[PDB]
Ligand binder design. Sequence first.
Ligand code: PAR
Ligand code: MG
Ligand code: MG
Ligand code: MG
Ligand code: MG
Ligand code: MG
Ligand code: MG
Ligand code: MG
Ligand code: MG
Ligand code: MG
Ligand code: MG
Ligand code: MG
Ligand code: MG
Ligand code: MG
Ligand code: MG
Ligand code: MG
Ligand code: MG
Ligand code: MG
Ligand code: MG
Ligand code: MG
Ligand code: MG
Ligand code: MG
Ligand code: MG
Ligand code: MG
Ligand code: MG
Ligand code: MG
Ligand code: MG
Ligand code: MG
Ligand code: MG
Ligand code: MG
Ligand code: MG
Ligand code: MG
Ligand code: MG
Ligand code: MG
Ligand code: MG
Ligand code: MG
Ligand code: MG
Ligand code: MG
Ligand code: MG
Ligand code: MG
Ligand code: MG
Ligand code: MG
Ligand code: MG
Ligand code: MG
Ligand code: MG
Ligand code: MG
Ligand code: MG
Ligand code: MG
Ligand code: MG
Ligand code: MG
Ligand code: MG
Ligand code: MG
Ligand code: MG
Ligand code: MG
Ligand code: MG
Ligand code: MG
Ligand code: MG
Ligand code: MG
Ligand code: MG
Ligand code: MG
Ligand code: MG
Ligand code: MG
Ligand code: MG
Ligand code: MG
Ligand code: MG
Ligand code: MG
Ligand code: MG
Ligand code: MG
Ligand code: MG
Ligand code: MG
Ligand code: MG
Ligand code: MG
Ligand code: MG
Ligand code: MG
Ligand code: MG
Ligand code: MG
Ligand code: MG
Ligand code: MG
Ligand code: MG
Ligand code: MG
Ligand code: MG
Ligand code: MG
Ligand code: MG
Ligand code: MG
Ligand code: MG
Ligand code: MG
Ligand code: MG
Ligand code: MG
Ligand code: MG
Ligand code: MG
Ligand code: MG
Ligand code: MG
Ligand code: MG
Ligand code: MG
Ligand code: MG
Ligand code: MG
Ligand code: MG
Ligand code: MG
Ligand code: MG
Ligand code: MG
Ligand code: MG
Ligand code: MG
Ligand code: MG
Ligand code: MG
Ligand code: MG
Ligand code: MG
Ligand code: MG
Ligand code: MG
Ligand code: MG
Ligand code: MG
Ligand code: MG
Ligand code: MG
Ligand code: MG
Ligand code: MG
Ligand code: MG
Ligand code: MG
Ligand code: MG
Ligand code: MG
Ligand code: MG
Ligand code: MG
Ligand code: MG
Ligand code: MG
Ligand code: MG
Ligand code: MG
Ligand code: MG
Ligand code: MG
Ligand code: MG
Ligand code: MG
Ligand code: MG
Ligand code: MG
Ligand code: MG
Ligand code: MG
Ligand code: MG
Ligand code: MG
Ligand code: MG
Ligand code: MG
Ligand code: MG
Ligand code: MG
Ligand code: MG
Ligand code: MG
Ligand code: MG
Ligand code: MG
Ligand code: MG
Ligand code: MG
Ligand code: MG
Ligand code: MG
Ligand code: MG
Ligand code: MG
Ligand code: MG
Ligand code: MG
Ligand code: MG
Ligand code: MG
Ligand code: MG
Ligand code: MG
Ligand code: MG
Ligand code: MG
Ligand code: MG
Ligand code: MG
Ligand code: MG
Ligand code: MG
Ligand code: MG
Ligand code: MG
Ligand code: MG
Ligand code: MG
Ligand code: MG
Ligand code: MG
Ligand code: MG
Ligand code: MG
Ligand code: MG
Ligand code: MG
Ligand code: MG
Ligand code: MG
Ligand code: MG
Ligand code: MG
Ligand code: MG
Ligand code: MG
Ligand code: MG
Ligand code: MG
Ligand code: MG
Ligand code: MG
Ligand code: MG
Ligand code: MG
Ligand code: MG
Ligand code: MG
Ligand code: MG
Ligand code: MG
Ligand code: MG
Ligand code: MG
Ligand code: MG
Ligand code: MG
Ligand code: MG
Ligand code: MG
Ligand code: MG
Ligand code: MG
Ligand code: MG
Ligand code: MG
Ligand code: MG
Ligand code: MG
Ligand code: MG
Ligand code: MG
Ligand code: MG
Ligand code: MG
Ligand code: MG
Ligand code: MG
Ligand code: MG
Ligand code: MG
Lengths: 49, 272
Amino acid sequence: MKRTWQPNRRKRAKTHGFRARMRTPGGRKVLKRRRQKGRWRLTPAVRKR
Amino acid sequence: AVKKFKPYTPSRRFMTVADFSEITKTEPEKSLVKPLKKTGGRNNQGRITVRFRGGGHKRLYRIIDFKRWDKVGIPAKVAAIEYDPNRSARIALLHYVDGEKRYIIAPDGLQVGQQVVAGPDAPIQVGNALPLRFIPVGTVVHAVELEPKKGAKLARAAGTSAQIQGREGDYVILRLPSGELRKVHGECYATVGAVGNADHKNIVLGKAGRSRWLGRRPHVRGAAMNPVDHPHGGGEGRAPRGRPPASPWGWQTKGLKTRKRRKPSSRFIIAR
RNA sequence: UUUAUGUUUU
RNA sequence: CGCGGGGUGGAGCAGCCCGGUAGCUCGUCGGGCUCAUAACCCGAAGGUCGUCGGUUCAAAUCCGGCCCCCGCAACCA
RNA sequence: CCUACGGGCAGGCGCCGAGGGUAGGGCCCGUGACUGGGGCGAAGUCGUAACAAGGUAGCUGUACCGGAAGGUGCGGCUGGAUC
RNA sequence: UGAAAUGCGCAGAUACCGGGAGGAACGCCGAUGGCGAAGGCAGCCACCUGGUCCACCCGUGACGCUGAGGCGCGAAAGCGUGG
RNA sequence: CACCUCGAUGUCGGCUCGUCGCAUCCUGGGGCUGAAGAAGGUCCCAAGGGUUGGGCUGUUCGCCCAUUAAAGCGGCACGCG
RNA sequence: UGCGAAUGCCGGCAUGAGUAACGAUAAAGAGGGUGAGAAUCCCUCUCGCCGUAAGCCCAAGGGUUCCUACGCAAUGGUCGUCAGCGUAGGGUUAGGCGGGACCUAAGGUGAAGCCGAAAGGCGUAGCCGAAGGGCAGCCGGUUAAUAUUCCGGCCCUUCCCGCAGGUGCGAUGGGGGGACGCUCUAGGCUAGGGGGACCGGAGCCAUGGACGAGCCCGGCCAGAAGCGCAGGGUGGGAGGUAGGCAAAUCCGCCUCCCAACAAGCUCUGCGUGGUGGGGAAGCCCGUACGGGUGACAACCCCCCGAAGCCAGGGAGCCAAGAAAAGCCUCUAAGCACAACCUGCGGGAACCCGUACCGCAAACCGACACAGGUGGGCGGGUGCAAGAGCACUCAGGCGCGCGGGAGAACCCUCGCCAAGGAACUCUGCAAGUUGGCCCCGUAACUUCGGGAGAAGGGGUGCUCCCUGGGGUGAUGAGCCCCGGGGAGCCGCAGUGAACAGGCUCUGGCGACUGUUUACCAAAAACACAGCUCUCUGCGAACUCGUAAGAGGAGGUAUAGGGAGCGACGCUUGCCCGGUGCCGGAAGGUCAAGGGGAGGGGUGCAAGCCCCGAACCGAAGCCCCGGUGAACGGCGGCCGUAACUAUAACGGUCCUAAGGUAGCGAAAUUCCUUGUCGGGUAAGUUCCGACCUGCACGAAAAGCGUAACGACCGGAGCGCUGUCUCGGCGAGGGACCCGGUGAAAUUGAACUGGCCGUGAAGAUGCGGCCUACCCGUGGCAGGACGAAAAGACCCCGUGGAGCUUUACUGC
RNA sequence: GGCGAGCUAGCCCUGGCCAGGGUGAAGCUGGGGUGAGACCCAGUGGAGGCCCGAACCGGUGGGGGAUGCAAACCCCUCGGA
RNA sequence: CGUGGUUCGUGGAGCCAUGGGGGAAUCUGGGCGGACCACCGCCUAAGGCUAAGUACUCCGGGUGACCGAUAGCGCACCAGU
Ligand SMILES: NC[C@@H]1O[C@H](O[C@H]2[C@@H](O)[C@H](O[C@@H]3[C@@H](O)[C@H](N)C[C@H](N)[C@H]3O[C@H]3O[C@H](CO)[C@@H](O)[C@H](O)[C@H]3N)O[C@@H]2CO)[C@H](N)[C@@H](O)[C@@H]1O
Ligand SMILES: [Mg+2]
Ligand SMILES: [Mg+2]
Ligand SMILES: [Mg+2]
Ligand SMILES: [Mg+2]
Ligand SMILES: [Mg+2]
Ligand SMILES: [Mg+2]
Ligand SMILES: [Mg+2]
Ligand SMILES: [Mg+2]
Ligand SMILES: [Mg+2]
Ligand SMILES: [Mg+2]
Ligand SMILES: [Mg+2]
Ligand SMILES: [Mg+2]
Ligand SMILES: [Mg+2]
Ligand SMILES: [Mg+2]
Ligand SMILES: [Mg+2]
Ligand SMILES: [Mg+2]
Ligand SMILES: [Mg+2]
Ligand SMILES: [Mg+2]
Ligand SMILES: [Mg+2]
Ligand SMILES: [Mg+2]
Ligand SMILES: [Mg+2]
Ligand SMILES: [Mg+2]
Ligand SMILES: [Mg+2]
Ligand SMILES: [Mg+2]
Ligand SMILES: [Mg+2]
Ligand SMILES: [Mg+2]
Ligand SMILES: [Mg+2]
Ligand SMILES: [Mg+2]
Ligand SMILES: [Mg+2]
Ligand SMILES: [Mg+2]
Ligand SMILES: [Mg+2]
Ligand SMILES: [Mg+2]
Ligand SMILES: [Mg+2]
Ligand SMILES: [Mg+2]
Ligand SMILES: [Mg+2]
Ligand SMILES: [Mg+2]
Ligand SMILES: [Mg+2]
Ligand SMILES: [Mg+2]
Ligand SMILES: [Mg+2]
Ligand SMILES: [Mg+2]
Ligand SMILES: [Mg+2]
Ligand SMILES: [Mg+2]
Ligand SMILES: [Mg+2]
Ligand SMILES: [Mg+2]
Ligand SMILES: [Mg+2]
Ligand SMILES: [Mg+2]
Ligand SMILES: [Mg+2]
Ligand SMILES: [Mg+2]
Ligand SMILES: [Mg+2]
Ligand SMILES: [Mg+2]
Ligand SMILES: [Mg+2]
Ligand SMILES: [Mg+2]
Ligand SMILES: [Mg+2]
Ligand SMILES: [Mg+2]
Ligand SMILES: [Mg+2]
Ligand SMILES: [Mg+2]
Ligand SMILES: [Mg+2]
Ligand SMILES: [Mg+2]
Ligand SMILES: [Mg+2]
Ligand SMILES: [Mg+2]
Ligand SMILES: [Mg+2]
Ligand SMILES: [Mg+2]
Ligand SMILES: [Mg+2]
Ligand SMILES: [Mg+2]
Ligand SMILES: [Mg+2]
Ligand SMILES: [Mg+2]
Ligand SMILES: [Mg+2]
Ligand SMILES: [Mg+2]
Ligand SMILES: [Mg+2]
Ligand SMILES: [Mg+2]
Ligand SMILES: [Mg+2]
Ligand SMILES: [Mg+2]
Ligand SMILES: [Mg+2]
Ligand SMILES: [Mg+2]
Ligand SMILES: [Mg+2]
Ligand SMILES: [Mg+2]
Ligand SMILES: [Mg+2]
Ligand SMILES: [Mg+2]
Ligand SMILES: [Mg+2]
Ligand SMILES: [Mg+2]
Ligand SMILES: [Mg+2]
Ligand SMILES: [Mg+2]
Ligand SMILES: [Mg+2]
Ligand SMILES: [Mg+2]
Ligand SMILES: [Mg+2]
Ligand SMILES: [Mg+2]
Ligand SMILES: [Mg+2]
Ligand SMILES: [Mg+2]
Ligand SMILES: [Mg+2]
Ligand SMILES: [Mg+2]
Ligand SMILES: [Mg+2]
Ligand SMILES: [Mg+2]
Ligand SMILES: [Mg+2]
Ligand SMILES: [Mg+2]
Ligand SMILES: [Mg+2]
Ligand SMILES: [Mg+2]
Ligand SMILES: [Mg+2]
Ligand SMILES: [Mg+2]
Ligand SMILES: [Mg+2]
Ligand SMILES: [Mg+2]
Ligand SMILES: [Mg+2]
Ligand SMILES: [Mg+2]
Ligand SMILES: [Mg+2]
Ligand SMILES: [Mg+2]
Ligand SMILES: [Mg+2]
Ligand SMILES: [Mg+2]
Ligand SMILES: [Mg+2]
Ligand SMILES: [Mg+2]
Ligand SMILES: [Mg+2]
Ligand SMILES: [Mg+2]
Ligand SMILES: [Mg+2]
Ligand SMILES: [Mg+2]
Ligand SMILES: [Mg+2]
Ligand SMILES: [Mg+2]
Ligand SMILES: [Mg+2]
Ligand SMILES: [Mg+2]
Ligand SMILES: [Mg+2]
Ligand SMILES: [Mg+2]
Ligand SMILES: [Mg+2]
Ligand SMILES: [Mg+2]
Ligand SMILES: [Mg+2]
Ligand SMILES: [Mg+2]
Ligand SMILES: [Mg+2]
Ligand SMILES: [Mg+2]
Ligand SMILES: [Mg+2]
Ligand SMILES: [Mg+2]
Ligand SMILES: [Mg+2]
Ligand SMILES: [Mg+2]
Ligand SMILES: [Mg+2]
Ligand SMILES: [Mg+2]
Ligand SMILES: [Mg+2]
Ligand SMILES: [Mg+2]
Ligand SMILES: [Mg+2]
Ligand SMILES: [Mg+2]
Ligand SMILES: [Mg+2]
Ligand SMILES: [Mg+2]
Ligand SMILES: [Mg+2]
Ligand SMILES: [Mg+2]
Ligand SMILES: [Mg+2]
Ligand SMILES: [Mg+2]
Ligand SMILES: [Mg+2]
Ligand SMILES: [Mg+2]
Ligand SMILES: [Mg+2]
Ligand SMILES: [Mg+2]
Ligand SMILES: [Mg+2]
Ligand SMILES: [Mg+2]
Ligand SMILES: [Mg+2]
Ligand SMILES: [Mg+2]
Ligand SMILES: [Mg+2]
Ligand SMILES: [Mg+2]
Ligand SMILES: [Mg+2]
Ligand SMILES: [Mg+2]
Ligand SMILES: [Mg+2]
Ligand SMILES: [Mg+2]
Ligand SMILES: [Mg+2]
Ligand SMILES: [Mg+2]
Ligand SMILES: [Mg+2]
Ligand SMILES: [Mg+2]
Ligand SMILES: [Mg+2]
Ligand SMILES: [Mg+2]
Ligand SMILES: [Mg+2]
Ligand SMILES: [Mg+2]
Ligand SMILES: [Mg+2]
Ligand SMILES: [Mg+2]
Ligand SMILES: [Mg+2]
Ligand SMILES: [Mg+2]
Ligand SMILES: [Mg+2]
Ligand SMILES: [Mg+2]
Ligand SMILES: [Mg+2]
Ligand SMILES: [Mg+2]
Ligand SMILES: [Mg+2]
Ligand SMILES: [Mg+2]
Ligand SMILES: [Mg+2]
Ligand SMILES: [Mg+2]
Ligand SMILES: [Mg+2]
Ligand SMILES: [Mg+2]
Ligand SMILES: [Mg+2]
Ligand SMILES: [Mg+2]
Ligand SMILES: [Mg+2]
Ligand SMILES: [Mg+2]
Ligand SMILES: [Mg+2]
Ligand SMILES: [Mg+2]
Ligand SMILES: [Mg+2]
Ligand SMILES: [Mg+2]
Ligand SMILES: [Mg+2]
Ligand SMILES: [Mg+2]
Ligand SMILES: [Mg+2]
Ligand SMILES: [Mg+2]
Ligand SMILES: [Mg+2]
Ligand SMILES: [Mg+2]
Ligand SMILES: [Mg+2]
Ligand SMILES: [Mg+2]
Ligand SMILES: [Mg+2]
Ligand SMILES: [Mg+2]
Ligand SMILES: [Mg+2]
Ligand SMILES: [Mg+2]
Ligand SMILES: [Mg+2]
Ligand SMILES: [Mg+2]
Ligand SMILES: [Mg+2]
Ligand SMILES: [Mg+2]
Ligand SMILES: [Mg+2]
Ligand SMILES: [Mg+2]
Ligand SMILES: [Mg+2]
Ligand SMILES: [Mg+2]
Ligand SMILES: [Mg+2]
């Protein structure tokens, strides 16, 4: 039956993407937090083109 | 008149529809003057500020002329009478001799191919607009300006109207469709006649769906809710109200007056 | 401007 | 037997708190008006206050028991 | 089978057919817990509507109301007494 | 009103004057009168329109009377929708 | 009453499957009778076996229909999820 | 700083156990091959399964899974030589397909501007934003693997430059246009399909017959200009002009004059078209596939025929159906040895995607998971139609453990003597019915319905006669609708598959619809419709501190709130209390005004404090109104010439004492009320009565046709529900081979009875019984497992909710 | 103080989808009817939160599954269409 | 007048700050010494800057009656994997 994950690449960037993080100060802080922990990825990896 | 239907389904049985014979050729409306696009949203920014709305037929906006003084002395011929989905009234398309085109909310009796005009000049026959000061006491008139130059506001609804009761100073006294007696500035335009298509009040939606078409989504009673949702929520086994009948937000909905007490407006009124 | 009523049969 | 109210001329109600005398409408009896009855008018009679005990100087009245009456309660199980 | 055999008969099949069965209707009669009013039956109860102007003139179609008669509104008739 | 009481009124009533709003009905004329098939119809004006009478003796030539059904009208109350 | 059980002893009725007690419903044996016979009443012995099918209600139970030799009462965590 | 317990924490290893399982009951068998090893890999043949798919093509999402070589430790539920797995190498080619150097939608963002303690929130233009608009590629061939991408053929787009011809050229600005709904549709076509006695073709004559107008296979695809058949779109002049925020010669409006017709001018679709290209069966090869030939293949007639195209076609309807650019036109600056337009020619054309999976072993579900996932194609025959159903093409599959056995038991199926609901809470379940044609059809009704009512008959095949319709001709064929007659066969003709059981009678809800994703689909919500109430427009109301926004680009026939809930007939009395509404008085009432009068301190001028009259809002008090506002709508006693009963009366209270209509009811406690009906028998059901514990009128009262997977009662039909079981089938269970879990588990050498014990003992006492160990089975016990009882209490634990609790905002 | 509407609810913009049967409203045309009408009858027409029924959307009853194929599935049946 | 700050929770409540209202003076001016008054004293508001002593440890170094791979940072090992 239809589950929770229904991946759509456009959603993912537009929602959790790098640029979307930088508008909201809440988001700029996530980046800050993630960067300070030294996460290898500050933002969900997405793809194609 | 009105359209009835043989009961060939339930609800086709009670259904009543508008009599469209009044409508001069129509089917497509008139671009140029109107339509614009209608942004069809049910909420303010983000959020629902009026309940039970949405859905219902896509609708083009005919942009209508509420300041007639715009062209004084220029006459115009009534080209058509059309169906406008955005109001109870019907709109008249009128061709000015300028070759300018405007829609007017169509008064009762105004018929295609008759000359119409606006100004202090202004014959007092139907479909014509004048400042109130020059309309003769006792004449029934529609599409009034509430303040001069601000545009028609009062009696625009299907088959509505206002009577001119008297005159005081630069103000004249109208009895509005509500029955309120109000002073309105003399310089305010208005247009002789009543609004027309007054049979409007007698159509019968007939069924759940017809109410949907009009963009009207089901309305649910507090009584049917839980107490989290409403003063009337809870208990069940149904219940009387158990308090003065209230709105979702808690104010009394039977009798409680609303109009702001101290209002500059307050000084120009006089009735119910 | 205070009244209602009169047992059955000859 | 849980909680509350009650028992007063023939009927229906007061009077009980706070003590001391029992009052109202109807009904009853006697007399009037009427040809007569009722209405109407003038007079009169009639209650130990459910009951036993207690309290007091005195108990319908304050107190306790028993007998009846009305109302409410009997939920989670 | 009989022949007087291009036949008749027995026999076979078929139509229709009394009726029987199944199904659904229409009319009439009887009957039924209960219920409605009606007629009739010397001396039971409540009132007094009508007959005299009936003590609110009566009656009337309708509507509403009321233990009951009745009452009241609207209009109508005189089959209403009274100067 | 029989007499009263309810009601209303010192929060300024009733009585009086001026202004406005709204609905209904049309005093005198008006008659014991007129019109209408009936129910019914009454301020004034205009439009549309029915019946009816009189004068003339001109035209049709019995084309008439009534009238089961049918159809239409039909006071008051009453009902539906809007006012 | 509040003793084991609230870090769980699933709770009515039915169904299936029984098993046991006897204070016996039937059948077997008896005494007494207000036991003529037949048929009962009443007590004693006796638990081997037997102890019906329906209508009503979730019902147990009752009531009712039709039968029967009889349509027994109980216990078994109101036996048995 | 010493561990045995904390359902402790981390780890390791046990127990159950060689136990359950190995993931759809579509299904397999054999021969050959490879190899150390083969049920499992390859190949052949036979068998079975999908086929509106389980085939094919898109889009998502995935991201090497693609092709090949070499591999088998692990992954694969077994095996593996195989693989979507390991290693390695290769593989994705575009001016025309998609997307971007185009447009705009919601929304987003946001010069101006507005607002906000900061962060930030708004917001006209503009900008971003697409599966919408716009825009030029068709057929075939090639690779192990890409192809509208390479190739071949045929065909087009834009940009730059240049010639020639033409024209007032010129835009982000004006105007046109783009440009739009739903249902139903016409004519002509195309895709697609069927038939052919015609054309082409390897071959074939068995097994009794057939050398035949036999069987079998195939009889196309694309294509500029021109042409033809369809169809779309469009009037042409002139004059006036004050409108289209400048200007227009354009558009608009007014008046004349021509056409009125597609005539014309166009633009599409289809046909034809130079030419190019394809091209079966079968047989021969080799697979791991593809290749030779069949061929110089043929390449045509007829029919059926779209939901597709002509497309902006038409008709009807109401709920009244995007934008912007491209495009055309108009003019403005400007510029007019510019420019733009048309034709020809040359040159110039960039970035990204392109493998493979894609109803699934490659996506979402921890899995090679019986689930989920949008668009297109989806052949043939028959059955009324159809995408339904059965079989079947193409194509794809037999689902990654097997072999046996033939027990109980389970699951899923088939049949059943007599009976036929006796089963049970209940006909739950399963039976019955079942498609089409015709006959036929009641109460009631809102006249539509109720209706598929009910209940019947027909249904195949054969020969003969025969009526219409479509194409063709006014004809033959071929399609399509039928009609009549005479026969044939079986148990049976919608011969298999798909395909209502029906009636009567209550309750609730009018109806279609909505809901507790994952125990409730309902009598609950919603619903048209009725009432009340608010709201004069910068409306009320809602969201927001605000700006702002919704309401609404609406205006009282509108909008918010509330109840009620189609419709029918109705909806009574009480305004004392509460709420709301009205009330220019009066009472109270805060700050403030006001200061009679008092106090501190100074020698004093003073400074500084209290502070009575009095004047001061709303609110409350107070007076009124209000019920489709919250709400409420009595008690005792008596009375009739039989008795009963009480139309009648008395009295007490109230704001008023429940009207109509209903009533043992979705309400009735007593209760299985009483009576009637149904039944052999009826705690339910139906009709009555009324003694209504404790109906009653918009938290509506009482009815109502129709409707209902709602809930109740009854009958017919028919049944394995049952008396009451039986047999049978298949998937399991069982035995063998392969792989191999789980909760649970103080340790165990773990019996019955009568006792005892913390009151229910394998574990204590007495006695009884009992050789050791298993396997298939049933569930009485281990107060069996699971979940630190949801009930209950307790905690001065918590949370949601209410209000005339307190206190605040 | 942040993160979430890739599930789910509502709404907004933009596209798409609904085999095939059945019933046969209005309106039209004609006929009758009338003073004129209402109206009646035919034929045509093709309306509907109309009917049957696939796709599609559901989730009614039952059976199965319950360390499942599945942390909601499967079969039969059933509602809309 | 309304609040904050101080130990000061309205308290006899000054001091410093200030949202609102009113609203001066320039040495004989002004604030303060805890309501107010007198006296006696202190200090000069409504402009600004100012090292050092102080805080911290991403970083380097030295020490340890600090751990020694279930310890010690989450990470001694290609771990914010
Ligand atoms: N026929 C009488 C009809 O009914 C009613 O009449 C009935 C009653 O009203 C009437 O009852 C009357 C009563 O009015 C009057 N006030 C008292 C009287 N005793 C009664 O009389 C009745 O009762 C007694 C029994 O005791 C009988 O014997 C007697 O025959 C009978 N009429 O008796 C009548 C029955 O016959 C109407 N009055 C009358 O208009 C109507 O027509
Ligand atoms: Mg779905
Ligand atoms: Mg997940
Ligand atoms: Mg996307
Ligand atoms: Mg999205
Ligand atoms: Mg890195
Ligand atoms: Mg916005
Ligand atoms: Mg936002
Ligand atoms: Mg309306
Ligand atoms: Mg509602
Ligand atoms: Mg609720
Ligand atoms: Mg909430
Ligand atoms: Mg609330
Ligand atoms: Mg409530
Ligand atoms: Mg209730
Ligand atoms: Mg009397
Ligand atoms: Mg007498
Ligand atoms: Mg008393
Ligand atoms: Mg007293
Ligand atoms: Mg005493
Ligand atoms: Mg409780
Ligand atoms: Mg016969
Ligand atoms: Mg009298
Ligand atoms: Mg009278
Ligand atoms: Mg009198
Ligand atoms: Mg009288
Ligand atoms: Mg009289
Ligand atoms: Mg009455
Ligand atoms: Mg009475
Ligand atoms: Mg008369
Ligand atoms: Mg007074
Ligand atoms: Mg006359
Ligand atoms: Mg008269
Ligand atoms: Mg006249
Ligand atoms: Mg003559
Ligand atoms: Mg003559
Ligand atoms: Mg006759
Ligand atoms: Mg009348
Ligand atoms: Mg009238
Ligand atoms: Mg205990
Ligand atoms: Mg335990
Ligand atoms: Mg014995
Ligand atoms: Mg005994
Ligand atoms: Mg015996
Ligand atoms: Mg004997
Ligand atoms: Mg039963
Ligand atoms: Mg019982
Ligand atoms: Mg017990
Ligand atoms: Mg038990
Ligand atoms: Mg049980
Ligand atoms: Mg240890
Ligand atoms: Mg220990
Ligand atoms: Mg441990
Ligand atoms: Mg085992
Ligand atoms: Mg086993
Ligand atoms: Mg096994
Ligand atoms: Mg071999
Ligand atoms: Mg070998
Ligand atoms: Mg094999
Ligand atoms: Mg992809
Ligand atoms: Mg890989
Ligand atoms: Mg591969
Ligand atoms: Mg391996
Ligand atoms: Mg291996
Ligand atoms: Mg393996
Ligand atoms: Mg596996
Ligand atoms: Mg090998
Ligand atoms: Mg590989
Ligand atoms: Mg190319
Ligand atoms: Mg492509
Ligand atoms: Mg492109
Ligand atoms: Mg470029
Ligand atoms: Mg753009
Ligand atoms: Mg913004
Ligand atoms: Mg900003
Ligand atoms: Mg696009
Ligand atoms: Mg596109
Ligand atoms: Mg393109
Ligand atoms: Mg092409
Ligand atoms: Mg190709
Ligand atoms: Mg279009
Ligand atoms: Mg067509
Ligand atoms: Mg062919
Ligand atoms: Mg042969
Ligand atoms: Mg031959
Ligand atoms: Mg072809
Ligand atoms: Mg000109
Ligand atoms: Mg201009
Ligand atoms: Mg279609
Ligand atoms: Mg089209
Ligand atoms: Mg069109
Ligand atoms: Mg643009
Ligand atoms: Mg130009
Ligand atoms: Mg110039
Ligand atoms: Mg490719
Ligand atoms: Mg593919
Ligand atoms: Mg699938
Ligand atoms: Mg698909
Ligand atoms: Mg799968
Ligand atoms: Mg695959
Ligand atoms: Mg698998
Ligand atoms: Mg998967
Ligand atoms: Mg799907
Ligand atoms: Mg069929
Ligand atoms: Mg198709
Ligand atoms: Mg199929
Ligand atoms: Mg095949
Ligand atoms: Mg398998
Ligand atoms: Mg058989
Ligand atoms: Mg049988
Ligand atoms: Mg039978
Ligand atoms: Mg039943
Ligand atoms: Mg049930
Ligand atoms: Mg069933
Ligand atoms: Mg018929
Ligand atoms: Mg019918
Ligand atoms: Mg039938
Ligand atoms: Mg048959
Ligand atoms: Mg046959
Ligand atoms: Mg023909
Ligand atoms: Mg035939
Ligand atoms: Mg069949
Ligand atoms: Mg069938
Ligand atoms: Mg059917
Ligand atoms: Mg419903
Ligand atoms: Mg429904
Ligand atoms: Mg649920
Ligand atoms: Mg839930
Ligand atoms: Mg369920
Ligand atoms: Mg349902
Ligand atoms: Mg359910
Ligand atoms: Mg907001
Ligand atoms: Mg606010
Ligand atoms: Mg605002
Ligand atoms: Mg706004
Ligand atoms: Mg707006
Ligand atoms: Mg309701
Ligand atoms: Mg009421
Ligand atoms: Mg009453
Ligand atoms: Mg009263
Ligand atoms: Mg009241
Ligand atoms: Mg009051
Ligand atoms: Mg009140
Ligand atoms: Mg005064
Ligand atoms: Mg006052
Ligand atoms: Mg003061
Ligand atoms: Mg002061
Ligand atoms: Mg006040
Ligand atoms: Mg007053
Ligand atoms: Mg009350
Ligand atoms: Mg008596
Ligand atoms: Mg008597
Ligand atoms: Mg009485
Ligand atoms: Mg009963
Ligand atoms: Mg009740
Ligand atoms: Mg029941
Ligand atoms: Mg009943
Ligand atoms: Mg009551
Ligand atoms: Mg009720
Ligand atoms: Mg009510
Ligand atoms: Mg209701
Ligand atoms: Mg009812
Ligand atoms: Mg239902
Ligand atoms: Mg069976
Ligand atoms: Mg078997
Ligand atoms: Mg003991
Ligand atoms: Mg024991
Ligand atoms: Mg011992
Ligand atoms: Mg053993
Ligand atoms: Mg065993
Ligand atoms: Mg056991
Ligand atoms: Mg346990
Ligand atoms: Mg516990
Ligand atoms: Mg507690
Ligand atoms: Mg607490
Ligand atoms: Mg927050
Ligand atoms: Mg969503
Ligand atoms: Mg929903
Ligand atoms: Mg489809
Ligand atoms: Mg005609
Ligand atoms: Mg439908
Ligand atoms: Mg259906
Ligand atoms: Mg189900
Ligand atoms: Mg179910
Ligand atoms: Mg189950
Ligand atoms: Mg089970
Ligand atoms: Mg403080
Ligand atoms: Mg304090
Ligand atoms: Mg202190
Ligand atoms: Mg202080
Ligand atoms: Mg000081
Ligand atoms: Mg200060
Ligand atoms: Mg200040
Ligand atoms: Mg100084
Ligand atoms: Mg100091
Ligand atoms: Mg001091
Ligand atoms: Mg002070
Ligand atoms: Mg100092
Ligand atoms: Mg360091
Ligand atoms: Mg060491
Ligand atoms: Mg380690
Ligand atoms: Mg470590
Ligand atoms: Mg170590
Ligand atoms: Mg560190
Ligand atoms: Mg660690
Ligand atoms: Mg590392």
